[PDB]
Amino acid sequence: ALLAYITPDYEEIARVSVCPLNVLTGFTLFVEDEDKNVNAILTRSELEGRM
């Protein structure tokens, strides 16, 4: 969550949950901007930020 917050032009955080459904991992709900890069566009900045 912290490194998704401090990365510019990233998908923004809606929620962050620790062990949802008693599942031994967390879950961050990321919301995309469909009007920004439709369903077809990926840039190197977005890919490296995702990495």
């Binding site: 901007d33 009007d35 920004k36 890069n37 439709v38 077809a40 840039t43």
Partner: peptide, 9 residues
């Protein structure tokens, strides 16, 4: 059509 919001698409 493609959206006018944001200059990317």
């Amino acid at each position: 059509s493609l959206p006018t919001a944001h200059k990317l698409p």
